[PDB]
Design a protein around this nucleic acid. Sequence first.
DNA 1: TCAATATCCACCTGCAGATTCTACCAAAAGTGTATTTGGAAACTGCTCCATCAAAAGGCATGTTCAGCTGAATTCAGCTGAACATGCCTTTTGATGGAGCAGTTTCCAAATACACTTTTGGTAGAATCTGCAGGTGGATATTGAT
DNA 2: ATCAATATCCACCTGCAGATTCTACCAAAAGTGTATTTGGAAACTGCTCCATCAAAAGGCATGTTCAGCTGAATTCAGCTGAACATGCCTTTTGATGGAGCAGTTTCCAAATACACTTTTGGTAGAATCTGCAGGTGGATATTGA
Lengths: 104, 108, 99, 97, 84, 78, 93, 95
Amino acid sequence: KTRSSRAGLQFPVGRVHRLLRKGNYSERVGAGAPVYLAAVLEYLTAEILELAGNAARDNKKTRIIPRHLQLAIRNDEELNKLLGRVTIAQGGVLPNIQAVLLPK
Amino acid sequence: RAKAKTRSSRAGLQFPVGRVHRLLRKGNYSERVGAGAPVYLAAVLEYLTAEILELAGNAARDNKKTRIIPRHLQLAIRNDEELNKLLGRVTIAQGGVLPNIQAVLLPK
Amino acid sequence: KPHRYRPGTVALREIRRYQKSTELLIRKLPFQRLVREIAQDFKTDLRFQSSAVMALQEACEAYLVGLFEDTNLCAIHAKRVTIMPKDIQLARRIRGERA
Amino acid sequence: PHRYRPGTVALREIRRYQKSTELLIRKLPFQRLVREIAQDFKTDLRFQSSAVMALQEACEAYLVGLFEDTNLCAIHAKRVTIMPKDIQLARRIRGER
Amino acid sequence: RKVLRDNIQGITKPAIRRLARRGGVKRISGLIYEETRGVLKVFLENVIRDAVTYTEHAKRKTVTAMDVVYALQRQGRTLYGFGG
Amino acid sequence: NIQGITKPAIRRLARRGGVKRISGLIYEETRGVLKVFLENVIRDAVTYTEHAKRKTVTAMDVVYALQRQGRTLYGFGG
Amino acid sequence: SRKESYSIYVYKVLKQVHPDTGISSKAMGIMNSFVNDIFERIAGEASRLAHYNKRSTITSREIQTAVRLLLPGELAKHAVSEGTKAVTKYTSA
Amino acid sequence: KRSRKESYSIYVYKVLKQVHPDTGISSKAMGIMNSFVNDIFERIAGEASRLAHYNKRSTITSREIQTAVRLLLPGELAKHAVSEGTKAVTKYTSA
DNA sequence: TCAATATCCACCTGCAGATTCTACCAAAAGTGTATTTGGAAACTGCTCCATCAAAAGGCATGTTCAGCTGAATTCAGCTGAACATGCCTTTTGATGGAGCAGTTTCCAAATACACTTTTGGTAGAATCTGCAGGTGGATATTGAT
DNA sequence: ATCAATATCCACCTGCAGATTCTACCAAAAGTGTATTTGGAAACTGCTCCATCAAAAGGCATGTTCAGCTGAATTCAGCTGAACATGCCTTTTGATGGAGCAGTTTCCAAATACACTTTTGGTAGAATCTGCAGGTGGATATTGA
Ligand SMILES: [Cl-]
Ligand SMILES: [Cl-]
Ligand SMILES: [Cl-]
Ligand SMILES: [Cl-]
Ligand SMILES: [Mn+2]
Ligand SMILES: [Mn+2]
Ligand SMILES: [Mn+2]
Ligand SMILES: [Mn+2]
Ligand SMILES: [Mn+2]
Ligand SMILES: [Mn+2]
Ligand SMILES: [Mn+2]
Ligand SMILES: [Mn+2]
Ligand SMILES: [Mn+2]
Ligand SMILES: [Mn+2]
Ligand SMILES: [Mn+2]
């Protein structure tokens, strides 16, 4: 009997509500906002984790690590933009070498 | 009863302390707002506008005008290193740009 | 004679000139028309406050004028004095605009 | 003996380092550098183990990023060797300088 | 009303040249003008989009200057002078 | 101390950066930038530290500083 | 004492997309930093949206617009989808 | 009946006379000056808001406004801002 | 093209630093009730946005025409890479110890409320004025010879 | 080094859009008495930073040798700027109609407050694994001849 289960979400609606409420954002908080926001957070999370899981697989690994999260993001146009000014610790960089720098 | 006396005067300021206090509460910054807060803020605000009007007013003097306009505001901000940094991502409508021509571009 | 300035003399003249002014350089109507075109391709039956169209032009010209500044640096850095698309792209790339 | 042409190992080093993610600045030196600068702002400070690592992470990322835009500039100048002028140009278009 | 098309060409070669001048540009390659139009198109599109988003959330049919200001703000392109 | 950041490390950084050839002047130029970066970040972190009346710079202090510098970093509490 | 984070929720969600995959400690960190960030961005914009419109309360209306404004085209659609969906469902039961 | 909207014009003008008793300011320039004040107000109040949150403090005191100012303004500008700030406060409090 | 010298890439292997998994206790989160009140209708007042008409001349178009800039080529010295050497600083680990980031109370000073009067501000009006636009004239800058 | 051709820079002028000063309400500061916290002020722990020590292990500092990269020079085809004729549209003014912001009231659906009642999430130990880090062995990729 929790809003998250009621919203069919795996993310804490109650917590999101408590945060929106405590974060000095507005005087009053709608009943649905925590749900909506919680949905959005969860969705974006799934998106990262999937691509990240695929990245882990391609490396023949079962456990996701920073590298995989960096490879997932910098490789996806949209996620890359949404996080263009964020740096993922321990993620390194996409392999890339300017053509003019190659031999022959 | 006691005669009304403004907080700005108590603080010795031009800017409206009471108005600033209102803005802070209504602004959703924190649950409660101390008393020195609007004073210190109105103070800083008044000092910053004073710093730029001085510089702007000079810019006006130099172009022989007596009424400050945006260009005068731009010249003041873009020539003073600090204000420039403080407003390095602010764009002033009708301010133009500082006259500057790269050397390589000049007649040899 | 007749008389005619050597290529570049007028350019520098034009630079000195336009850097002294603060007026807008894109014509008002052609630009308003361009806003309305773009806007309605996002949402129809729209209306604009006189000032909104002006706030947009002030912004666009301010943006372009600054991009050309950076572009001009890239050209020069390339031992050139003529800006080329290459430069506008290097600029925007480093700016992190369309990296 | 057997030598590799100039740039052959360089490319090799590139491919290797773009592959890994380990920090590339030696820890202690850095530790020391951070603490020194910090001392000029507040004395007898203590640094949380993690706080230092965060800085090195942030810092090494920043540089690697800057070396990227720098290389782009050097190339734009028909070069293959980055020079101080390239860093300067990059940082300027970035709005840091 | 009337149909709007190809208005990007309203940004004449003369005007783009004037702009480059203020930017302190002496010589301009023939291919700049169209690149410029490209860049401007994108810039405007992004700003008008956010602007209109603000307008719709306000349940209005008129884009106000503030909408454009908040739009520019988001793009990290803060503009002074139209505070309303 | 700044001299502690050696050529070889700077080489490696440039390498991950995709740089193939390095002018001899880069190393010293690089330390200059590297120094300004820490000065700016650290200076802010410490400011966050003192406002907390603490004597220990915390990772969160660095994180918040890194955010103010537009260098948002994931992995240390945010 | 207590120090809450999204670790659980991230993990639960992890298991749905990859029931077979695991996640390193540092990786979880990147994920928390991620959620807090986005959480802050959306809540932030939503806060402003209500002020510009002189409203005392932040509703799904604001959060949705906030998403349109912050997330990239395709990402925004799905986000908007998932969002309205959770509310609808939540409202029904 | 058009509702009334506030601004800082009155105060900007006062301060202007103090620095250049002889100088005026166009309405467009005051337009900019207003944007400036609102801008910095928001920047400061914001970092202050944030700073209090971090320190589990529910109230924004002048000590917040001050750290905020040190974080947002550069060198000298911060030095003088802080004095003026402090000075004003103590005066205000000191009767 | 060969022949040799490092590099790289696989596969399989085994310890071990982290992960999982296992069990519990208090802060949160979910319920019920009783109020409160934000802001969605239903209206209307009335800015100000879209359009129109018309005349004028500032500018946008398109051509010519050739100065001189960008773009190949060539070439040499000299900077920066590849390397074998060899010594010094950094990396790794307990060890304790002292500093200090957190909590547990206290409560006195400071802030929030409620609501009751006072005025500083804002919106027009009526009153002024810096200066945009024009001009003629003393310079100043360019470019040919 | 003129010196003829043009573009500039300046001071003098003066009616008029705009900037100021003048006035009359009225939102919203300021007051004053209460009720409610906030968070600074000693004491008192754990727990993580700091120091110290102590090796080896790499990793960095040096000096050689020369490959090949970066400029400096030349050269020239033709792109892009300057000047000019033509006449298209944008710019200016002034006048409306009416789409729609906006100010008012009305007041339920929905959010806040509260007192309880039940979870669920964060810890602090116990129970496995995913991989790093090696070890061959086998083609590769580079290079010199
Ligand atoms: Cl809601
Ligand atoms: Cl090009
Ligand atoms: Cl250089
Ligand atoms: Cl205070
Ligand atoms: Mn003065
Ligand atoms: Mn109400
Ligand atoms: Mn024509
Ligand atoms: Mn020719
Ligand atoms: Mn040339
Ligand atoms: Mn040679
Ligand atoms: Mn009065
Ligand atoms: Mn004039
Ligand atoms: Mn109507
Ligand atoms: Mn549980
Ligand atoms: Mn391995």
